[model samples]
Target: AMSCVYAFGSNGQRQLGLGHDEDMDTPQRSVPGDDGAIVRKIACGGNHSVMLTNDGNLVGCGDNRRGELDSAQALRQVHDWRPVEVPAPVVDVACGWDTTVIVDADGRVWQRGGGCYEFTQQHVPERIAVYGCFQNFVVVQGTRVYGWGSNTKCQLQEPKSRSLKEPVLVYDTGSVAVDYVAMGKDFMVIVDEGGRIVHASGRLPTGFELKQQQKRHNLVVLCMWTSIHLWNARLNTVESFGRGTHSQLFPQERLDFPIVGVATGSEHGILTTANQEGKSHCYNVYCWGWGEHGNCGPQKGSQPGLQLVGQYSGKPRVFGGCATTWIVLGS
Candidate 1:
């Protein structure tokens, strides 16, 4: 399995891109052509999954109806990863319920599918979003955070019930740029470069103390339907807030080593840690929360909590969305 990407959990809709329709309890290598294609990043929609290859082309699997993969219906009912033609090389991608958002190397953003509001002619932007449900967002020129799509919960700034057609200025952080955005289905959390929660739409966390007594640069935010997690890069620590999928929120403990990455699915999450035992190209994978479909690995159930899944190599990339978890290792 050279350069093959492993998919864990939920594949009824073939959302795992495994070249077959079946659920997985363990990480399964998706498709069989990954050895020749370098997978850069992967984004999963409600019933579909998209991949950005190092070659800059777009690849997809699962239901592509309404053009989730391309305008052609040939991609629909797709059980294997297939390439979709684009005007430019895609650099980044994010998926909504059934829609796909792509950021090209030319600094252009292209979105397709019937899951969110349709748009065109947006340019010179970096970074992307849209988790939970509808509503989409992107940060351009560093400070200006633009948003569009469903705002039913005022997730795109207080004009509830009024759906936005085009991107609008939601946050104008004039000087300091944004580091990462945890755009939830009904909430929003933006982390600034100075390592602080400058803008938030949901009822952010505050009651419990972080205990670290710090917030510097390089912070990250991960959001699910009912919870939000902040990764303090400086201290290599994590904090959680909000109601858990099972309600009543979740809790996070301190880690003894460096946490390389963390991702959130519709009802679950996966965290990766850099192997500190001097093991080159190896990392520890941990999963928690809801995984009735097995996204949480063998350590799954109603109260699976968090547990180490396994150790992976190849400078891995973790993508969580809908009810699927994909661990992509470079070829």
Candidate 2:
């Protein structure tokens, strides 16, 4: 069975990979690989797009100015999508602006573009941080948080340096053990095994609290642009605080349903809800915030509240970029 991939909003650089560079106001199918590719995940960058297939193949399209698409010198954009060669079986893919990172099945990280401090521009993939993001990267190999990248606002927390070319142990995170790390444009949030946000640095929202809530529900942290959302998996409640005025971190109606997942872009947010019967493979999507570029479906303008995006089949995953939206539906 062929999975359905839909894209809308800005496509000036063909970030939607719809075989043409044109912005879309409505969702449209982008059946890359001629329907042979069983896309399991989709990720969007500032001007590029990436997809991961169930067969362990990594594919990319759109802007390659910083080698984001891993294409040739003359090919400024990948109008037609193609596979991205990696050393091992890829399990995860992430993108930020002009940078691309993939986590192999073995837990190693492969990177390309300017995000890799070692190279001003990495045309070919190389192993840099064990894990991290474009603005900031973190490696949690031995239970220690090793970080690098943009630290102008102390995101990396390098004692004597504002920028880091190499990964440095910024957070020892002793005894408690770090569960996961979320990196934003200018901040880093570290969650501990107890489902509490133990550390926050850089321009984080004021008075952000998570430690006390963990006793009541398990929490997961998500970051985009400059805001952070703490989602309680147990209660299905989300608390958000961030930098943008066009988008709201917390939508009141979201508390009425059990949110399965949420994603954020430069100026938009997407929330997915579980089926009434608590079944998988089908979900109702809600989108809010700036939709001037049509990132929020057919709705135009800013939406401070969640708007129903209708029900969709296939395992749905949402992604947002500078001003675009993508929904990947696959088994």
Candidate 3:
């Protein structure tokens, strides 16, 4: 069970759940519940953060504009950690710019929030005809990949429609099994079989190579807005592709380190690495890119360079969003 949830970066909407709206440049602690429930999955939006403890209890913090939260009132907007009613224990969760998407154990996909493509504000979770959603850009129900939402950049494949209200098949891996998929604001990356990239959609940079052979299955890919990054776990290194005008996006940049986990915000990149302290699993957190809102650190400018942000022990999960970062440690 993961314990002592720590959050940082922007919190104007109290997304950090630190009991206030002040932004934190360094790691801060917050407990979603005192029930001793294990933390499962966490999802962050433009100005909100949602969590599903092992008990199936779903809780959240931050903005409630359009009543995206069931407990939010007309004038009552920002709030601290609060639990939301659920039909069943949520098995997984994902967040959009201002939307919250979750899947129950029954395999039902529920979506809430407004400012979404082709949809208005939805206070309550609405059932969508889909198996499960990873990123708002793509949905998966096995070897089949379904694309929904905005297609302005054609990331979801043909037709180039404004957005798909319903899930539509974009790719089918009949024989080869698809392991994982990562989607940026407008791009998508598919990792199949053994952590090797099988496909990429949307605006790709020139001279970009597909399926770079992996030395080990520990490799990872982050399809962030306007850029793509590859973490070669075997070599303990990180590689960035595309542009980094305002975010962590960089064109073919590589950094050496032992990364345990990684995540990204629109304007920042975060990584957890290990340090050999004589003999220990000492884990440390690092961030880069933008920090105007203290997302990168105490600095107030672009931090294209990685800098130590904090640390955590035990198995960890890292989350980065709209300018926020969260780390949860577990045994």
lDDT of 1 by residue, 1-331 (tens): 3456788788887878776677887888776444567777787778888877777878888887756775665646676777766768887777777777777777777777873233344542344432224345554447777766777767666767557667767777777887666766666776677777667663344442333423434557787766777776677766667555452243455677688888888777788888768746578987877777778777556573466767866557788877688887755
Tens digits of per-residue lDDT for model 3, 185-300: 77777766577776777666544566553333656887555666778677676677766766565323454446777877665788877765636567778787777888777875
Each model's TM-score, in the order given? 0.84, 0.83, 0.86
lDDT of 2 by residue, 292-330 (tens): 887887777675777666577644888777778888776
Q: Which scores better on TM-score, 1 or 2?
A: 1
Model 3 regions lying over 4 Å from their true place = 71-78, 115-135, 205-207, 211-218, 247-257
Report how far residue 97 has shifted in candidate 3, in Å. Answer: 0.6
Which sequence of candidate numbers ranks them by TM-score, best first? Answer: 3, 1, 2
Worst 10 contiguous positions by lDDT, candidate 3: 117-126
Model 2 / residue 224 / CA error / Å: 1.8
Question: How high is the CA lDDT of each candidate model?
Answer: 0.69, 0.70, 0.68
Pitting candidate 2 against candidate 3, the one with the higher lDDT is 2
The per-prediction tally of clashing pairs is 1, 0, 1
In candidate 2, position 305 carries an lDDT of: 76
Would you give me the overall lDDT of model 2?
0.70
Pick by TM-score: which candidate is best? Answer: 3
